[PDB]
Design a protein around this ligand. Structure first.
Ligand SMILES: CC(C)(COP(=O)(O)OP(=O)(O)OC[C@H]1O[C@@H](n2cnc3c(N)ncnc32)[C@H](O)[C@@H]1OP(=O)(O)O)[C@@H](O)C(=O)NCCC(=O)NCCS
Ligand SMILES: CC(C)(COP(=O)(O)OP(=O)(O)OC[C@H]1O[C@@H](n2cnc3c(N)ncnc32)[C@H](O)[C@@H]1OP(=O)(O)O)[C@@H](O)C(=O)NCCC(=O)NCCS
Ligand SMILES: CC(C)(COP(=O)(O)OP(=O)(O)OC[C@H]1O[C@@H](n2cnc3c(N)ncnc32)[C@H](O)[C@@H]1OP(=O)(O)O)[C@@H](O)C(=O)NCCC(=O)NCCS
Ligand SMILES: CC(C)(COP(=O)(O)OP(=O)(O)OC[C@H]1O[C@@H](n2cnc3c(N)ncnc32)[C@H](O)[C@@H]1OP(=O)(O)O)[C@@H](O)C(=O)NCCC(=O)NCCS
Lengths: 431, 431, 431, 431
């Protein structure tokens, strides 16, 4: 249901559906969107269980919360807005119109979250969407597509507002990328897929990688910073791109911070020898060990023969491979800094020019400003866990497509629209 | 001044300048922008004369007005705006940050207009820009770059906020497109350059082609529609992408309309035989005749041995090559329509799926709506000349980079920025 | 529950509640607001029945729809918004803070609609409210107050977010008006109460009277204009201030229009003699006959011995007392106009400088503009029934407090807040 | 020129002018506004000198800067904005229309600043204005009116966009307040005039009094706080309502702060005996000594026989009459606080429920938030002089009419407009 044997079929189906969607009222779109939100909540446990079973990554309870967040806080048609300028020369409107059929490449970390979040946004703007799901999360992804189409059916149709394929491949992704009925592709993934999309001759909205540092200075609430940082790091076993993945801590509070992490936040400190063993396990000749990504801390420790604990920590240099590299594992090094400017320099290196996400615990407005300016990320969270950036304990809406590479930031319905100016000359200014 | 021997030098220079620009206050940027506006006005006659002399296209008086429009109505730092959401969970800001060094590929139709308009916008957002000017308008383009740098010098620097090269080529455009210090390219030109940009692995903001129809229905002010349409068509000899390039007229008013065009608007009606000769002249085995593009009507008529007149008109079918093809010449066919829905169908075919610009003369709100929905263009002008779309007799700002292919519409400073969300958790909501 | 024996008690109670509300999160306010919306829908039939029984005015089915509209389309906390300006000099925020305890004077036409609509808006902005209900609709009004407090209790409190008195009087309204703990009064009623409020030394948000003309010109869809106009006029038996209360029709379509009204819209045309009898009935030495206001057409006709029909119509001069005077009865005179400018002149006289509401059926953009500029009302509806102005078949939110006298227009949560500027100097601009 | 013998003449003249202004284009209004800005700058020295000579208050150099600020940063027609909502049900616009002729009551502290600032704003929205100037600043005020009319003449008229009377009185203010052609009064003054305006049966936009505390905590940059606070306090000899008028300082930094004030900021510390003499001088049986208001510190000290120095300071209790009372003199008491919460409590008492202005020097986000929430003022400045609140070293526009009593905050053009909703049903949504 919405799932096809080949990519050309999927696209044609979505194209037919879009002729209806584009003519639907906002109330009609919103009825479908409401049905999607409801079904996402109703089946959050199933979606969450499916992802862990299929990919081996993450954990069920956190994926339930992520789907609840998508359902509650993804913008709908209220995100489609109009500007008006009027005067003696008349009325000029700027509207957000559909692109048409949008292609979307989705990850195996937040598979159904991305699919459902993209769909709500894209439908609100009058589009339909065709997915090429990640090959490691195909069943989970297509289940979400099927749910979306059931929701639309329950609200009177049409079917195929979201489409996918049974056996997504590099080849089927290439059919999408070169298909002339797809004017826009939303690429949520790694530099591999995204560069390909930005080489397609289409507009591409491109997520990128991150390696988010969290800087803690001596003005911070250190007890709360420990709680926030481990909560954010270990959320869905560090799978989210936004999650804290290393700490830069001012010398004077580093011991207090790590002590709290061990004593109150379920962190286990590993020795140099244990760091060496863990490094050899999780970084391989083929790169990141796929058998380790998104595993919980107790499992990773077990894998190297070390038997409550939810995070692995240690103090190290920024160049340490478990600190400099984005692991998507609950492994969190603490880098000690001599001074604030030292700390900012370390955090900037650690972010690696991704301009994705960065975090700080500090009560000082000048410090916060300095860091924000220097690090220049799509996301900056101050005195909360990273997930405050997508509306979990922070103001603002949720997305799972953070267009750090192409600059649109946290994408929503308005992102996936074409701008149209309508100039009504010398009339309809009523003033 | 701002002009370099090779593209790598240009880019490095712009990159150095941008480290200063990004740290400049809005007042500092605006001082430079004001100086640029002033200099553009001061040298509009020179820029206009240079373009006609160098390219052989357009006319001086209209290019003066286009530069005046750029100077008066291109947005500056006021276009860089901030959103805030606040509540018990604190304060979330969304800001527009710089990309960095932006590459820009510019046309030979509105060469200096595009360069100056792009620069004002890009500087406002904290960027610098490197141009690869059109090879047919190199001297005009680089003069504009030099003016921009003189303006910046007059306001205290820095130099190289806008850079270019002495001898732009396909090769130098390729250095820009593949340069890792350029994260964004603004491509103002034809499908050739734009597709290349959208294959570059960078975000590309892409202008496209158009073929703007103007539909006149029987409710229109026909005398004024004749005036508006010929004024818009013949503006800078039909060079602008937005200009009217064919008419679709309801049968009942078509004769009245064309009569007005001949009697009051300086139009000359050509016979079938003359249409045939003109077609053979302006469409060639190599495509559009470069020796004809942007020539005035008296010149084009002279070229086929026909000796006040500012536009060539005739009645014909939509498929007629002087009607279906975008000529950028003051040649305007009138296509007769049986009914409104017939007229909309003809206009939609004639726009060729460019979703660029379209125009209508009608006083009927339902008719206007029908047409606007069906034609789905970045620009729709109602009851005015096309140039009302860029702020000449219409509400709204000016641009010369209309991103019809990639969907950003009429570009301005905000277009050329990265979005950043800053989440201040549990503080700085003062309510 | 929320209802007190005397006004000073009510105000103190609301004042205590407001110390909690102002510190509530938007999510907490919205939980209560959601409960209020739900309860309003659940008890819409009861509220509607109570009003007709108590006041003798209006009709139950339409009052059900009015309460559904209030519940669905009154803005909540989303209407409380923040502006931000940032640059080198730091960050400036403008926020909407509470006034405190707001007093409100409400009508007997839309009693509970006004109370519930005011409360949702006022609560969203951090205020509480104290009502002095209309003495003709006390039981209906206080039932609505009780419902509001039940909703708040169901969501965890506090009680007394809305308060009222058991026996509202002119005297108790004067205690409210002169009470130093009430910095703002929202006055929904007649010139009597509103002027008193604007003499109170407090800010007053003041509804005024109207006499809304609907102009139909020869370009209109006349069959649909007949339907829309009688639907709008007869909605809740013409009680709403926005409702059509006289027609100005271009000569050429007047007969067609009235024919449709009689043949398809349940209108009964009265003779001059019948007009005379009806005039003597409904206009009295004491003014409008209270026994006639808000009665259906069949009843009014019966009252003068005339026995499907839902509206009384006739053709007459603008000065005819059943045309020039706001009756809040389904009595609708048609004034014939020679020309558009004649029609605009007649409609402007008929609106009596209230600048409240006016309506037009016309497909011509210039005509619409002319009329809109000339009539200068808080509300102008084009080609729909009047109730499109409050979100019933038109874009936009619902209100029952239209501040035509003081200029705030269709009031909502943002209306009832104080503006606060917060200047964070030389920090927290992250760009 | 714009100045009349009696108030009825002034109002009729303004009423005639407004029929033209309301029909003027934004470009036409802005041409006049530009001329007003230019003339204000050109004659700032004259306006400044006139005020000091006439009233005996303030100082010329600071009044020059205040007029430069008015000219540069008062919003014009860009502050008049439009909202649009569109969908299947059509297009709804909300516009800002004129009130008409606005009455304005202006002060003798910032006489011409208020007049010019009000006029720019009011003209932008399509209004004209009639002033009743303060009787102590009549010549200065009417000079400003004359300048405004010269500016309008220079831009082609009309004359009388701003009107005044030769001999303003309580009686002429009452003619304005009760005049039926004035639907709105902007009252910039003391509780006396404002309450009268809020008793007039008109909408009144009401400035109120203040007594702005500046709280300095132990996290502040104390050297800079000393500079900022004395600069803000002593600006135009403490005449502005926004200016710092007492300090609440955390014990631990109070001595450092006052030491800096004496050593670097030209403060003179007075003994208890000198405080007693100064109190007897400046507070009298008739209230504030008019012969002392707005005098410089050297003069006030001289007046009690005490002979570089620009501010008088001393440490005292909050109830000390030179601390608790708003003096509009460069007299600044420092109140010592035991703790932050103590300091907030003291500052809140000192503001006296005016909800006007308050200030803080602190680098701590939580502290700032606590204070902002507790003090609930129209203006809160953090880590700058008070005048950052009107755009002098802070983000945001300038006003001299801060509607603290009625809640509109820092008034501008949009403040002085009526809101109009225009519902275009089932057309002109182009999506
Ligand atoms: C989670 C992860 C380790 C799983 O690895 P995996 O199972 O081997 O799958 P991969 O993502 O490496 O991709 C396998 C191949 O399919 C491609 N691919 C990825 N997503 C695809 C999709 N929807 N559709 C089609 N092909 C896809 C990849 O490019 C790759 O091809 P390649 O061999 O030419 O490089 C990996 O996806 C990853 O590291 N993702 C992080 C990217 C990201 O968004 N990071 C921010 C979050 S912290
Ligand atoms: C005006 C015009 C007829 C002049 O033609 P021209 O002098 O032959 O120049 P061209 O634009 O055709 O380009 C010549 C070559 O340089 C390329 N080129 C164009 N702009 C370039 C630029 N800034 N920098 C480097 N190369 C450029 C072209 O791709 C082309 O290469 P190709 O042979 O591989 O196709 C032509 O530019 C044109 O038709 N432009 C319309 C595009 C447009 O924006 N239309 C909307 C306005 S109505
Ligand atoms: C419906 C209506 C005819 C009922 O008349 P009514 O039962 O006699 O009640 P009234 O509104 O005339 O008011 C009776 C008295 O109580 C006053 N009053 C009205 N509302 C009051 C309220 N909430 N609380 C206290 N007193 C109120 C009135 O000022 C009046 O006092 P008065 O004798 O000094 O003038 C009358 O309210 C009316 O005409 N309202 C229209 C006002 C309006 O908003 N029109 C736009 C809608 S079309
Ligand atoms: C500066 C000041 C001390 C000068 O005092 P003044 O010369 O005696 O003039 P006043 O303002 O006291 O007013 C004198 C009388 O004219 C009235 N008045 C004030 N402004 C008026 C105006 N434009 N037009 C007509 N009457 C006016 C006053 O109400 C007063 O009448 P009253 O005797 O019934 O009370 C006094 O105006 C003042 O204290 N203003 C502060 C109000 C304010 O805005 N404070 C915030 C700034 S810190």
């Amino acid at each position: 249901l919405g799932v096809f044997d080949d990519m050309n079929q999927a696209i044609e189906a979505a194209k037919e559906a879009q002729l209806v969607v584009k003519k639907m009222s906002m109330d009609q779109r919103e009825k479908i969107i409401s049905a999607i939100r409801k079904k996402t909540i109703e089946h959050a446990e199933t979606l969450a269980r499916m992802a862990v079973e299929e990919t081996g990554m993450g954990n069920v309870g956190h994926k339930i919360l992520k789907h609840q967040l998508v359902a509650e806080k993804t913008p709908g048609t209220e995100d489609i807005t109009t500007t008006a300028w009027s005067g003696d020369r008349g009325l000029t409107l700027v509207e957000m119109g559909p692109f048409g059929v949008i292609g979307a490449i989705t990850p195996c970390t937040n598979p159904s979250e991305t699919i459902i979040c993209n769909t709500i946004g894209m439908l609100a703007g009058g589009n339909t969407v065709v997915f090429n799901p990640h090959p490691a999360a195909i069943k989970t992804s297509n289940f979400a597509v099927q749910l979306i189409n059931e929701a639309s059916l329950s609200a009177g149709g049409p079917v195929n507002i979201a489409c996918s394929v049974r056996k997504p491949t590099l080849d089927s992704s290439k059919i999408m990328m070169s298909h002339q009925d797809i004017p826009l592709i939303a690429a949520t993934g790694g530099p591999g897929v995204v560069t390909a999309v930005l080489q397609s001759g289409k507009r591409g909205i491109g997520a990128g990688a991150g390696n988010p540092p969290v800087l803690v200075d001596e003005t911070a609430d250190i007890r709360k910073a420990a709680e926030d940082i481990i909560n954010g790091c270990t959320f869905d076993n560090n799978l989210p791109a936004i999650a804290e993945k290393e700490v830069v801590a001012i010398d004077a509070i580093a011991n207090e911070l790590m002590n709290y992490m061990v004593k109150e936040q379920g962190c286990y400190a590993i020795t140099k020898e244990q760091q060496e063993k863990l490094t050899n396990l999780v970084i391989t000749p083929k790169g990141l060990n796929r058998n380790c990504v998104g595993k919980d801390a107790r499992t990773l420790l077990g894998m190297i023969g070390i038997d409550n604990i939810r995070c692995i920590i240690f103090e190290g240099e920024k160049e340490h491979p478990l600190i400099s590299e984005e692991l998507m594992m609950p492994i969190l090094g603490i880098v000690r800094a001599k001074s604030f400017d030292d700390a900012v320099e370390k955090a900037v290196w650690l972010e690696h020019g991704n301009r994705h996400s960065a975090h700080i615990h500090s009560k000082n407005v000048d410090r916060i400003t300095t860091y924000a300016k220097a690090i220049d990320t799509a996301i900056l969270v101050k005195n909360a866990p990273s997930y405050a950036a997508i509306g979990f304990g922070g103001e603002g809406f949720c997305t799972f497509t953070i267009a750090s590479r192409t600059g649109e930031g946290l994408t929503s319905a308005s992102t996936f629209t074409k701008r149209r100016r309508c100039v009504m000359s010398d009339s309809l200014c009523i003033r």
